[PDB]
Design a protein around this ligand. Structure first.
Ligand SMILES: *Cc1cc2c(cc1C)nc1c(=O)[nH]c(=O)nc-1n2C[C@H](O)[C@H](O)[C@H](O)COP(=O)(O)OP(=O)(O)OC[C@H]1O[C@@H](n2cnc3c(N)ncnc32)[C@H](O)[C@@H]1O
Ligand SMILES: O=C1O[C@H](CO)[C@@H](O)[C@H](O)[C@H]1O
Ligand code: F3S
Lengths: 114, 531
């Protein structure tokens, strides 16, 4: 279990999404390793605490840092991914990603259902 | 050649096209580079703040332009308020990044002083412009509503295109607001944007990206009339930042001097000279062209070049509605509240146009959630993202500001860009005229909130820029408090014209680029008469 293995399973827990890109996962890890995960213990430790039990305000602060990176797709004011950012995926049924058309006529006059 | 045009913006390209189509020979000089849209789009996707609308247009060292994330400090803003407005310096200019709102001014707007006592009238009246507005609307490709909604600008032909359906967001609000008070008069906004394939461009697919770019050019960008004017036979030389208009022995212009990206000086001679360089870089070529027979700076024997400079001071509100509305479906703005565009009060206050945002709020609402520094299970997180980005409503307005000669732009004695050209030193203040309106503007907001079940109501009471750089070479009666005649020809130089909002004695209550195109077409007509 390299840093990537642990990162990627943490991310599957924290985000709840199965099939997150490892091509993007590697990029978010490397970007985050500028400012976070300075120890080689912090990630395995966060995986443990996040599993059964509770987190320190500093462990929950790191969880958030990881979620934040997958949802917004930005680390340290640098776009890692635009199109594959998870927040877009959460409202894909109703909202588009600005600068990408829906393949439909758009049709925005309808009230979204759910 | 015959005609020299400075500024490949919309104003410059309309002129360049008209006169190049009439077989007459044209040189179009652009400060900035030729950058295509696929590039702007890519720079857009790669930029961390998608609210920064200047950020995907590089501030070239030879032809800089204002940036604010972070500040590039290109403008020197002294005064009591920041004139931190935006403009692009590349082929096609600032209509690359506009919201493509295409309004006409109303009848009073031209006779402000006579009607209201404040401000300052135009030479021309609504009805000299009307036929020119209509061709503007056809040339840009403007959609707007038919006779079921009065916009209060007397029409002869109908809008070239109909609007596409309002978003559930904009329609629901229009119904609720007009039902609380029909004086508000929420209407469909006229826009340089396609409801069907038109002048070669496609129909609008709902990219929600209007500012800062369309990927498909469904909405009008000045680059349309550049590629046109070019096919007509105009010569495009980009990376030609003009710093001087040379006068000759007849009180007439005879050349424009311009530097390349190297700073190496070049010269171009012509019979006629159109200056379309936005309402800052234009005065900045005038006051910088001072010489022997023209001490006080070219075309400026009124002391008025760079003065009576205006824009629409902005004021907003935000809240979460009680009803799911889903901003970000369709164009960013489709709807405006025009109930205060005119009336008695405009002798006390500033008029306004208020407008609802239809801009996607996922990024903003997701960021907001992560600042609460609370880890939630993926399911609460996703729920709260959908709820917040569904109920967010934001309002924004344009207040009028009147043409005051204190408010002005001058080239810097001290400050210089990477190639020697002095830099804009704007001085600017916002008087109780604008502020007394904005107190009422803010009662409308408070009411709108209450109508829509408003929660987390925040008032945005800091006056925001609105990129309508207008007044800087005011047109008028005679040359002893004016720069240009009713024809937008300079009182001093008979072969010099100003295609820009610089020529507009009033900023009014609406996006001014349509009016710019009105005058650009009107001028092109006049100049075509001259050999
Ligand atoms: C930033 C912005 C502006 C804007 C808008 C939204 C945003 C985010 N929404 C608008 C809207 O909905 N409706 C509207 O009417 N206007 C809106 N705007 C403003 C609009 O873009 C401007 O009013 C319009 O672009 C002005 O047109 P004009 O053709 O007069 O000027 P320009 O587009 O700024 O282009 C000027 C060109 O001149 C060149 N230039 C300047 N100085 C020089 C020198 N010295 N030498 C050579 N060329 C020069 C610039 O490079 C530019 O191309
Ligand atoms: O005309 C405009 O379009 C927008 C309409 O609200 C606004 O955000 C900009 O500041 C202004 O330039
Ligand atoms: S960016 Fe383009 S497709 Fe429509 S909503 Fe705006 S015009």
């Amino acid at each position: 279990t390299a840093p990537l293995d642990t990162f990627m399973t943490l991310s599957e827990s924290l985000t709840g999404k199965k099939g997150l890109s490892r091509v993007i996962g590697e990029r978010l890890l490397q970007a985050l390793q500028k400012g976070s995960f300075k120890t080689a213990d912090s990630l395995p430790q966060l995986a443990g605490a996040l599993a059964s039990g509770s987190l320190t305000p500093e462990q929950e602060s790191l969880a958030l840092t990881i979620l934040e990176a997958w949802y917004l797709g930005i680390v340290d004011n640098v776009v890692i991914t635009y199109e594959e950012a998870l927040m877009f995926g959460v409202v894909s049924d109703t909202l588009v990603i600005r600068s990408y058309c829906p393949n439909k006529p758009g049709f925005w006059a309808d009230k979204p259902i759910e | 050649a015959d005609v020299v045009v400075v500024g490949s913006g919309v104003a410059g390209a309309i002129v360049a096209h008209q006169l190049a189509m009439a077989g007459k020979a044209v040189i179009l000089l652009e400060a900035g580079p030729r950058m295509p849209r696929w590039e702007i789009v890519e720079r857009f996707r790669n930029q961390p703040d998608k609210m920064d609308f200047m950020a995907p247009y590089p501030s070239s060292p030879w032809a800089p332009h204002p940036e604010y994330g972070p500040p590039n400090d290109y403008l020197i803003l002294k005064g009591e308020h920041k004139f931190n407005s935006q403009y692009i310096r590349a082929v096609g200019g600032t209509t690359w990044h506009w919201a493509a709102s295409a309004w006409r001014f109303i009848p009073n707007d031209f006779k402000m002083k006579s009607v209201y006592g404040v401000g300052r009238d135009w030479p021309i009246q609504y009805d000299d412009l009307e036929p020119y507005y209509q061709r503007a609307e056809e040339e840009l490709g403007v959609w707007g509503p038919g006779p079921e909604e009065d916009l209060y600008s007397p029409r002869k032909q109908p809008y070239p295109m109909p609007p596409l359906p309002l978003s559930f967001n904009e329609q629901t609000i229009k119904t609720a607001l007009n039902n609380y008070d029909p004086k508000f008069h929420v209407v469909t906004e006229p826009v340089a944007r396609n409801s069907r394939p038109y002048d070669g461009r496609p129909t609008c697919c709902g990219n929600n990206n209007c500012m800062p770019i369309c990927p498909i050019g469904a909405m009008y960008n000045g680059i349309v009339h550049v590629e046109k004017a070019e096919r007509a036979g105009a010569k495009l030389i980009e990376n030609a930042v003009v710093y001087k208009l040379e006068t000759g022995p007849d009180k007439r212009i005879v050349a424009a001097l311009y530097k390349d990206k190297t700073g190496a000086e070049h010269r171009v001679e012509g019979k006629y000279f159109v200056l379309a360089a936005n309402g800052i870089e234009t005065p900045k070529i005038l006051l910088m062209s001072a010489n022997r027979d023209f001490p006080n700076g070219v075309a400026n024997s009124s002391d008025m070049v760079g003065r009576n400079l205006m824009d629409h001071p902005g004021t907003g509100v935000s809240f979460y509605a009680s009803e799911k509305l889903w901003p970000g479906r369709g164009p960013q703005e489709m709807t405006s509240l025009i109930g205060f565009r005119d009336g008695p009060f405009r002798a006390t206050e500033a008029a306004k146009k208020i407008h609802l945002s239809n801009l996607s709020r996922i990024d903003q609402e997701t960021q907001k959630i992560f600042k609460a520094g609370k880890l939630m299970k993926p399911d609460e997180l996703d729920a709260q993202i959908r709820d917040r980005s569904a109920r967010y409503v934001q309002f924004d307005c344009f207040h009028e500001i009147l043409p005051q000669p204190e408010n002005r732009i001058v080239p810097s004695k001290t400050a210089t860009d990477a190639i020697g050209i002095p830099r804009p030193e704007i001085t600017y203040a916002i008087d109780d005229y604008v502020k007394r309106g904005a107190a009422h503007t803010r009662e409308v907001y408070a009411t709108a909130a209450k109508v829509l079940g408003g929660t987390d109501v925040v008032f945005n009471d800091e006056f925001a820029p609105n990129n309508h750089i207008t007044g800087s070479t005011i047109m008028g009666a005679d040359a002893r408090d004016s720069v240009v005649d009713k024809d937008c020809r300079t009182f001093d130089h008979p072969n010099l014209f100003i295609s820009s909002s610089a020529t507009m004695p009033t900023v009014g209550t609406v996006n001014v680029t349509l009016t710019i195109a009105a005058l650009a077409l009107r001028m092109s007509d006049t100049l075509k008469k001259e050999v």
